[model samples]
Target: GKAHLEAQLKRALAEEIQALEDPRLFLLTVEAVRLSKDGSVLSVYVEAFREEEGALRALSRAERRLVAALARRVRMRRLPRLEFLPWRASP
Candidate 1:
């Protein structure tokens, strides 16, 4: 169940971000989706673009919309709060 939820969230988030009109966010890649075991929070790791400020702004702007999109795509007892963070791990 956890694995399935992770996959579903990753896919939904990627799709929503890619569909955004801002090209700055378009280059940002969704690296992974980390969900709490209790399903209270979801951390989204992304490789933000070189235009950092703009990329983050675009992401922030689209965050709520993305969550709504995910809500429509997946159904769960509790909808996790989404948090976007940079992908800092080694490539």
Candidate 2:
């Protein structure tokens, strides 16, 4: 139950992020998605070839659209709030 929902959420976000036309996201990759224990929040980890901060800022502004995109694709009773984070593995 837990893993399925998390995996599905990640897939939906990755696809949705990829489809967005923002130049900031052109070099971005959805690294991972982690859901909160109570499912109230989703941490979106992304890696960028450059301007990581710019990409996150762009994504934060598009948060609403991204949530709507996921809602249309995934059948879920609860929608977690999104938080964009730079990939932790970056140096």
Candidate 3:
């Protein structure tokens, strides 16, 4: 029950992250989002355009907006911060 809701929220966040269009370029990908057992905290993992340093930096700056967007998507008691950081490319 809780897990399903968590998964749903994560997917919604992922879709929102992927569809984010800004700066006239730079694509954002929702790498992952892990919800706590209690669903209080949500860890949103995002990587942009093959992990470009500039893109990552830009995303870091735009994290607050992302967090706000997340707050809007989830109907939870408390919204979590949307932390941003560079991600290593996987094979």
Model 3: residues >4 Å from true position, as ranges?
1-6, 36-41, 86-91
Q: Which ranking of candidates, highest lDDT first?
A: 2, 1, 3
How does model 3 score by TM-score?
0.60
**Where is model 1 more than 4 Å wrong at Cα?**
89-91
List the candidate numbers ranked by TM-score, top first. Answer: 2, 1, 3
Which structure among the candidates has the greatest TM-score? 2
lDDT of 3 at 61: 69
lDDT of 2 by residue, 14-84 (tens): 99999999998996888888888898888989998788889999999999999999989888786888999
List the global CA lDDT of all models.
Answer: 0.81, 0.87, 0.61
Q: For model 3, what is the error of residue 6's alpha carbon versus the real structure, in angstroms, after optimal superposition?
A: 4.2
Candidate 3 residues 13-40, lDDT tens each? 7676566665522566666666666665
Pairs that clash in candidate 2: none
Cα RMSD for candidate 3? 3.7
Each prediction's TM-score against the native? 0.83, 0.92, 0.60
Worst 10 residues of 1 by lDDT: 82-91
Error of 2 at 85 (Å): 0.4
